[PDB]
Design a protein around this nucleic acid. Structure first.
Ligand SMILES: [Mg+2]
Ligand SMILES: [Mg+2]
Ligand SMILES: [Mg+2]
Ligand SMILES: [Mg+2]
Ligand SMILES: [Mg+2]
Ligand SMILES: [Mg+2]
Ligand SMILES: [Mg+2]
Lengths: 59, 48, 138, 164
RNA sequence: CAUCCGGUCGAUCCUGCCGGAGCGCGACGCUCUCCCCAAGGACGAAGCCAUGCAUGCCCGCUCACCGGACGCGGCGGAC
RNA sequence: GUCGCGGCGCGCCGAGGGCCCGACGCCUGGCGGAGAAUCAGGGUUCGACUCCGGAGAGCGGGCCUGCGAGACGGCCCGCACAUCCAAGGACGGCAGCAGGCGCGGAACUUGCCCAAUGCGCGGCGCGCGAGGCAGCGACGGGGAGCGCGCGAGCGAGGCGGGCCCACAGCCCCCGCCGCGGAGCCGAGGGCAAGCUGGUGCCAGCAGCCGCGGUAAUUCCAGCUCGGCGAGCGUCGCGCGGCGCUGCUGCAGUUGAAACGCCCGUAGUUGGCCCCCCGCCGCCACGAGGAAACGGGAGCGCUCCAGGCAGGCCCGUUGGAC
């Protein structure tokens, strides 16, 4: 019977763009969500990069 | 000599009791509303 | 009168109770330490062992078995209660052995037996005597 | 550690010290029959609550009438009892509290108020209706048979406006 | 939320122990419709370790490549 | 010498200090506290683990950097293990999160993310196996249900849409079709609950008394019946039972128990009396000092186990004590 919730009315879009949790922006019709990358591969890449010396842009 | 020497009727297919709370209700009418005692052999002779 | 009752005599009362509370057989058996070392079960609920031989005013011979505890290497006898369970136990089969109702003491008319058999090859004896499970793997 | 470790918890019922006692069995069965009780844990909960009330009343009664703690705690206890309807309005002495029984607790159950309003054919019928969600306590539908109704809502327990 | 019961005798009253009856902590056996909360290799082995991860960030220093690299430096890593 | 006092170290001098109000020595399957279990009152047992404090990172030692470490996801050595080698050399410390071996009666995914609470760096952010979410999960706790009625209704279950979510679930809301399922113990007494067939002191039951040597009211089966209930039973431990450890509150002629008798030190206990002063104990009040847990005021998470919320015109809304 009863449903309650919270609102949030911003003066202008730029203020909203600046002040707004990112995932809320994706949920609303604001921005497209790029395909996320697994943090595991990022960690592996970071470790491998930390291993090499000097110029390590190779990997 | 052989253990288990001392260690056939087909089971009597009769309806299950009314489970849930109805079982309590079944007892309530069993003895108070319905005539009782219990345990005599002759009583079973009446039942048979 | 007999006991001390002065207002400055708590030390004597504490000492007297400390000394005299060792006279109880139960308190001794529980807090002295001899039983724990002498008990082949070392305070455990039940033990896992290996059977090695089958043997058995009332004049009924009771069926039991000789066992050696894996973790202790001392020998004891445990009695298999439920009928027809002698055949369910075979020489050199892993078993789990617990105790009777009376801790330590013998129970019933059985002389020199203070344990029970409750599992063989990992199957509860009760679950097998009622045909719930089967010991086809052994 | 996890935040889940700080969530409190306790039991809510007790078991008789002597289980096999014929009079107690018969009385409990009779109470189940007059209130259509499922199992015997509900009677244990009722006895738990009654014991708490009685212990509080005793402790307050040992103290002097003009004790500030006595006034505060007795006033709170009386207010709660009256708002629940378990104790009559005309009584406002802590002494009357010791004479309360679990039956007064049962009379304020949802099934009880449903039946004494003649809204249901029986306790069992009331329970089955409660399960199907045809009842609107106050303005909110409730499907808990053991829900207790306060005085201010007893006149407001109705049939669900959505039920067929 | 102040409770007891059976067992020494041909029968009886005592002392005295044995056993039963409840709660909690764990282990074992059987069984299991729905929802909510929720502990989880401590129990005389502080025994032994493949595999993967658990501490980075940036304000200064750009003739590096087309400013992002990298490195010097600073903070932190003793929480 | 140390940040610094000090036998902390050295030189000299003197002799001293502790002890039945229990030193010293030995043992401990000995981290401590706030607390937990039990239940008339007085108490007994436990206290790995949530918060505070202490100690350690295979054993024993040493050191640099730094405000701060005698640090080990820092280095050096010895010892015990271990690894790679193109045999000359090199390298390691999961009592961090998952995972594996062994051990035992005994204990889970080699998952996703920093969005929340905080930490480090830094301006419009990054990272965090801290921490959160999900997976397994009958340690366990709370709430419903296997029908009511002479016919209707309603669950669980599936299909789709919402809502929620870092993404997904899950609860809950909405439309369509609609799986109704109870076991574990026992029937001589304690202890609520009785009919035939077998066997014959055999097989077996039995916590205790006991049954079974031809009606076996106790074994093995059927019927019946009782208890609790999505739980039931078995094993070990603690509390209670226990006024069988007795301060409250045991007994001591004969049941177990007054030293053979006297003296006597520590120790314990000590008649009556002073009207107001000081000191000790004692009682009451007060300050000061952590929360959680516990008690407890108020608030209808649909109730509840819980949580500190929440409504509109809120004590300054509240979270007192
Ligand atoms: Mg230790
Ligand atoms: Mg700590
Ligand atoms: Mg350290
Ligand atoms: Mg070190
Ligand atoms: Mg390490
Ligand atoms: Mg470290
Ligand atoms: Mg004597």
């Amino acid at each position: 019977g009863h449903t309650v919730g919270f609102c949030n009315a911003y003066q202008n879009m730029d203020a909203l763009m600046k002040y707004e949790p990112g995932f809320r922006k994706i949920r609303c019709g604001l921005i497209e969500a790029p395909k996320p990358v697994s943090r595991k591969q990022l960690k592996n890449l970071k470790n491998r990069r930390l291993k090499k010396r000097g110029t390590e842009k190779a990997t | 000599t052989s253990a288990g020497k001392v260690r056939k009727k087909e089971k009597k297919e009769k309806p299950r009791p009314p489970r849930g709370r109805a079982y309590k209700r079944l007892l309530y009418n069993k003895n108070f509303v319905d005539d009782t005692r219990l345990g005599p052999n002759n009583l079973l002779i009446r039942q048979k | 009168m007999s006991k001390t009752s002065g207002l400055y005599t708590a030390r004597k009362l504490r000492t007297v109770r400390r000394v005299n509370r060792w006279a109880d057989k139960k308190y001794r058996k529980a807090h002295l330490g001899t039983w724990l070392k002498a008990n082949p079960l070392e305070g455990a609920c039940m033990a896992r062992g290996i059977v090695t031989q089958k043997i058995g005013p009332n004049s009924a011979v009771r069926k039991a078995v000789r066992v050696q505890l894996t973790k202790n290497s001392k020998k004891i006898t445990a009695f298999v209660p439920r009928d027809g369970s002698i055949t369910y136990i075979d020489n050199n089969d892993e078993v789990l052995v617990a105790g009777f109702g009376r801790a330590g003491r013998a129970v019933g008319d059985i002389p020199g037996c203070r344990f029970k058999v409750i599992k063989v090859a990992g199957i509860g004896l009760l679950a097998l005597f009622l045909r719930k499970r089967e010991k086809r793997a052994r | 550690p996890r935040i889940s470790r700080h969530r409190n918890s306790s039991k809510t019922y007790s078991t008789p010290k002597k289980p096999f006692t014929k009079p107690r069995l018969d009385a409990e069965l009779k109470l189940c029959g007059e209130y259509g009780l499922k199992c015997k844990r509900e009677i244990y909960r009722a006895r738990y609550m009654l014991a708490k009330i009685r212990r509080t009343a005793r402790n307050l009664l040992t103290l002097d009438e003009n004790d500030i703690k006595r006034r505060f705690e007795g006033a709170a206890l009386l207010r709660r009892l009256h708002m629940l309807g378990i104790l009559d309005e005309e009584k406002d002495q802590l002494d009357y509290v010791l004479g309360l029984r679990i039956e007064d607790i049962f009379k304020r159950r949802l099934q009880s108020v449903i039946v004494e309003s003649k809204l249901a054919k029986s306790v069992h019928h009331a329970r089955n209706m409660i399960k199907a969600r045809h009842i609107s306590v106050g303005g909110q539908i409730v499907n808990i048979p053991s829900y207790m109704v306060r005085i201010s809502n007893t006149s407001r327990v109705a049939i669900a406006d959505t039920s067929s």
